[PDB]
Amino acid sequence: RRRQLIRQLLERDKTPLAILFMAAVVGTLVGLAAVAFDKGVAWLQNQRMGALVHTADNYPLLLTVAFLCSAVLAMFGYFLVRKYAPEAGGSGIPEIEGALEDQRPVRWWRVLPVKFFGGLGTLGGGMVLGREGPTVQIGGNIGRMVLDIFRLKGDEARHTLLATGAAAGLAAAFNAPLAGILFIIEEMRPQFRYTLISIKAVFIGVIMSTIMYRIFNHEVALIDVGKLSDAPLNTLWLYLILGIIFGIFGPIFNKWVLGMQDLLHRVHGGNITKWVLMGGAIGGLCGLLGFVAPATSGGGFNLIPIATAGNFSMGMLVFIFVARVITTLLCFSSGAPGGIFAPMLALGTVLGTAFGMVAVELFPQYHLEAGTFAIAGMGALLAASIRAPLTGIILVLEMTDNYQLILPMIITGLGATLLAQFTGGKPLYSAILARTLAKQEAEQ
Amino acid sequence: RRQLIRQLLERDKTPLAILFMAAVVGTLVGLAAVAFDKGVAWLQNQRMGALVHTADNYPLLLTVAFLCSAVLAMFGYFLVRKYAPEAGGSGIPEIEGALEDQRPVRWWRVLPVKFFGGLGTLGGGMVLGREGPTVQIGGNIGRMVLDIFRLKGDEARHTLLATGAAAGLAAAFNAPLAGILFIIEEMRPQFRYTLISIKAVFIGVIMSTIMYRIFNHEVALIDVGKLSDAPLNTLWLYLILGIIFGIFGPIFNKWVLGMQDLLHRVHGGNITKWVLMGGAIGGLCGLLGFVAPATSGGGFNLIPIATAGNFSMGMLVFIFVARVITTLLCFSSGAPGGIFAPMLALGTVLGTAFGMVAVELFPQYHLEAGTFAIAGMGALLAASIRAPLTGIILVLEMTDNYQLILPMIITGLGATLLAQFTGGKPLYSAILARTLAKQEA
């Protein structure tokens, strides 16, 4: 295998030109798709807001069309999934992850309109879910689509185009090119064996998708946090502690999402009508909460800058944290189309700010700013529950642009993962793919 | 499939022993890298005061400039040729091979050789970088604790050897992310599966970086300021620049390989002719390090100057050509020291050059040449070493201009694409191959 290596080394990085070109095609489509999906979610959330103004006097009526508008939208999403594409329920990352292991199918003819229009309903209703879920799975399916259409042959192309799709899908969801590519090579790709995924090609796709997002969303950032203060060396130990706190909570939260999947399955038993009804109740709860306490519902991207700036009270942070754990579990574990990835950014930000608040008062000698502990905690639930810290760190970095916190961010992230491992926790997506793969033999 | 279901449920459970030892490896590599850096600076400093001692007799002054660097160079070439030949050149290909289990990690020899050998060449003012020493040293450090504590298993041998090199690149640039990314994009075995725990590599990189911060806080290797943004209608200029790097990469790649050959003739493999040749080269840099400092040294000093556009077009052309010459002369000679960093200075200069032309051709874009410098900084890395994700993330960690992430990523891929399409190969992988081929012949 020495003489084999010398041959391989000299042939290293020579991706087939066909795959490189198709990577650009896949990337472009996924971008436009993720852009259209985002524009769609916004519109529906906006129509719902105008409807509440139409009835802005009769509070009980106003509380009703709030419920109903989101309820109907949720049901349309739950139905689209249960009836035409059950594999489009939940995040969609475990499914695309399975497709790379060649253990799950990519039924793009069904999932593309199901996820797009199903997620459009759940997110548009104001449920606590994220765009990654839809965009990643859609993007993966888009990639499979061009593979079929152009009939490209080979394991490399199937694995690559499927990978650049999900990568370009995560990138367009956050305007985070680096975080998308990193997600493929740290979490998405097959973890227990070799594969032929061209990073160069995944890159090309991510570029175009990100470029597409920039044609339609320039000048405004998803999260603006401003330039925060630096972090002294003697203050680092506070971040390792915060990571540990995330480290024991990650696995706990991980059980809850899994366990709430079970408990909610009993409510409908698998029945398409009980389920869609249950989803309308859940979706209606968020649309209601989306009026009476907007920080307890929605994507949560709005409270992140507020939390970081320290404009919340300690009681509000505890309220938001507990209330969002509840509505995150209720929305994701119910099987609605929509990721859990992004709402863990809001949960982490709040939990970090909370820590920073106590840290500020306990040590005035450190001249602390609670916003530094929020930025550190933003990608911490990602590291403790999803167990992909490198992605979470680079993601938060791309979204917050506070690089002088790179050490606290990294330290808080590893503390999350280490204690997540040491307390018996498992990666959420890998534990879900396993739960699904095990049932696909349980009923045999 | 049921195998997968078993594997998924057991995913990411790195042995606690490997995790703890990763922290140890990282700490040691950090202090080592810190000590190496403090050493190099000291020697560069003494040489500078020596030139002051004789700051009147210009020909004498030009001599003790030559001599001080010549002697220092020779001490490095000798330390390598006599005790550890595998410590010559970068050291990245060597550690890369060690991960393939196709090269040995002789830490009892390489550690003092690379440390004190690199101390000489770098301290003399030769055009090389600290990555080479620090990465190889770090990998050896990682091997050392593996042996000492007698940790068994392929995972531990592969991991500890990987966190070492990662922690070594990190401490050389104050770039933790770029270090970790280097292992998972270039260093690790590229054609088969391996058991390298990313979480563990991370832990090592932390401590090493932390160590660097205990001794180097408050000052950055490269300060460039906040540059202007890049409009969408301006991106096509970055793809063009990436193409220019794309065709030059492979060419420069042949040159380093070819000059390795041409310089081997001068000494034939003889330890005396070689060390003597090294003293002439090292002496040249110490001379150039006085008469035209931009043509010698690590090059980290001209990057902010270039980016701020304080250079003329002619000076940029001068610096570029003069540094192509002194980079090949220093690295292809076999001296201990990486080629990684001196390509940052080469790419920055080439980019600024491009940006200058862009500024005058299109005043409607309201350009700033410094944006094309930042884009070009990790472009030679992408064209010649062919590790663009690392290069992009490295420059990002060193320049802190994230609003240029699209131009940087585009210029990077334009480099790798055209590097591939013009028959270029990854330098380090082409060097490890050159070495593995002489071994079985």
The helix, strand and coil proportions of chain B, stated in percent and rounded to the nearest 5, come to 75, 0, 25
Complete DSSP assignment for A274-332: HHHHHHHHHHHHHHHHHHH-GGGSS--TTHHHHHHTT-S-HHHHHHHHHHHHHHHHHHH
- Are A418 and B199 in contact by the 8 Å Cβ rule? The answer is yes
Confirm or deny that A333 is annotated as ligand binding. Answer: no
Looking at the complex, report in whole angstroms how far the Cα of residue B397 sits from the nearest Cα belonging to chain A: 8
Looking at the complex, report in whole angstroms how far the Cα of residue A247 sits from the nearest Cα belonging to chain B: 14
Nearest CA in chain A to B426: A12
Could B426 and A13 be called an inter-chain contact, meaning their C-beta atoms sit closer than 8 Å? yes
Given in angstroms, what resolution was this structure solved at?
Answer: 3.0
Q: Which residues contact B339 (CB under 8 A, 6 or more apart)?
A: B90, B128, B129, B132, B256, B327, B331, B427
| Minimum-distance CB partner of B102 among A5, A185, A413 | A5
Rg of chain B over Cα atoms, rounded to whole angstroms, equals 21
Separation of alpha carbons B74 and B70, rounded Å: 6
Could A421 and B199 be called an inter-chain contact, meaning their C-beta atoms sit closer than 8 Å? yes
Could A410 and B202 be called an inter-chain contact, meaning their C-beta atoms sit closer than 8 Å? yes
| Minimum-distance CB partner of B386 among A13, A20, A389 | A13
Please identify, in words, the CATH class of the domain defined by B1-441.
mainly alpha
Q: Which residues contact B343 (CB under 8 A, 6 or more apart)?
A: B327, B380, B381, B384, B385
- Which of helix, strand or coil describes residue A397? helix
Could B11 and A191 be called an inter-chain contact, meaning their C-beta atoms sit closer than 8 Å? yes
Q: Which two tokens stand for residue A63?
A: 């509380």
Separation of alpha carbons A178 and B181, rounded Å: 11
Confirm or deny that B428 is annotated as ligand binding. Answer: yes
- Strands of A311-426, DSSP E: none
Experimental method: X-ray
- Which of helix, strand or coil describes residue A339? strand
Looking at the complex, report in whole angstroms how far the Cα of residue B350 sits from the nearest Cα belonging to chain A: 23
Confirm or deny that B90 is annotated as ligand binding. Answer: yes
**The dihedral sign for the CA sequence B181, B183, B186, B191:** negative
- Are B400 and B67 in contact by the 8 Å Cβ rule? The answer is no
- Which of helix, strand or coil describes residue A145? helix
Kindly list the residues from chain A whose CB atom is less than 8 angstroms away from the CB atom of residue B191: 5, 8, 12, 194
Q: Which two tokens stand for residue A58?
A: 């009769």
User: Which candidate in A9, A395, A402 is best for mutational testing of the B interface (most B CBs within 10 A)?
Assistant: A9
- Strands of A342-444, DSSP E: none
Angle at A413 between CA A407 and CA A415, to 5 degrees: 105
- Are B298 and B129 in contact by the 8 Å Cβ rule? The answer is yes
| Minimum-distance CB partner of B176 among A214, A233, A410 | A410
Nearest CA in chain B to A94: B8
Kindly list the residues from chain B whose CB atom is less than 8 angstroms away from the CB atom of residue A214: 232, 406
Complete DSSP assignment for A156-205: HHHHHHHHHHHHHHHHHHHT-HHHHHHHIIIIIS-SSS-----HHHHHHH
Could A394 and B177 be called an inter-chain contact, meaning their C-beta atoms sit closer than 8 Å? yes
Domains of chain B, residue spans: 1-441
Separation of alpha carbons B125 and B41, rounded Å: 10
Q: Which residues contact A367 (CB under 8 A, 6 or more apart)?
A: A229
Separation of alpha carbons B121 and B279, rounded Å: 9
A-B C-beta contacts closer than 8 Å: 170
Confirm or deny that A96 is annotated as ligand binding. Answer: no
In Å, how far are A90, A207, B267, B330, B331 from B124, measured between CA atoms? 61, 42, 21, 11, 14
Q: Which of B413, B434, B433 is nearest to B190 (CA)?
A: B433
Could A194 and B192 be called an inter-chain contact, meaning their C-beta atoms sit closer than 8 Å? yes
Could A199 and B185 be called an inter-chain contact, meaning their C-beta atoms sit closer than 8 Å? yes
Could B409 and A207 be called an inter-chain contact, meaning their C-beta atoms sit closer than 8 Å? yes
Separation of alpha carbons B53 and A420, rounded Å: 61
Kindly list the residues from chain B whose CB atom is less than 8 angstroms away from the CB atom of residue A236: 210
CATH label, A1-444, candidates 3.40.220.10, 2.60.40.10, 3.30.1490.100, 1.10.3080.10? 1.10.3080.10
Could B209 and A418 be called an inter-chain contact, meaning their C-beta atoms sit closer than 8 Å? no
| Minimum-distance CB partner of B2 among A191, A192, A441 | A441
Q: Which of A404, A368, A372 is nearest to B220 (CA)?
A: A404
Could B436 and A9 be called an inter-chain contact, meaning their C-beta atoms sit closer than 8 Å? yes
Q: Which of A407, A365, A388, A427 is nearest to A242 (CA)?
A: A407
Q: Which two tokens stand for residue A119?
A: 């997620």
| Minimum-distance CB partner of B406 among A10, A210, A433 | A210
Cα atoms in the 13 Å half-sphere on the side-chain side of A272? 10
Q: Which residues contact A57 (CB under 8 A, 6 or more apart)?
A: none
Separation of alpha carbons B433 and B431, rounded Å: 5
Complete DSSP assignment for A39-94: HHHHHHHHHHHHHHHHT-S-HHHHHHHHHHHHHHHHHHHHHHHHHH-GGGSB-SHH
Looking at the complex, report in whole angstroms how far the Cα of residue A387 sits from the nearest Cα belonging to chain B: 8
Looking at the complex, report in whole angstroms how far the Cα of residue B48 sits from the nearest Cα belonging to chain A: 33
- Which of helix, strand or coil describes residue A90? strand
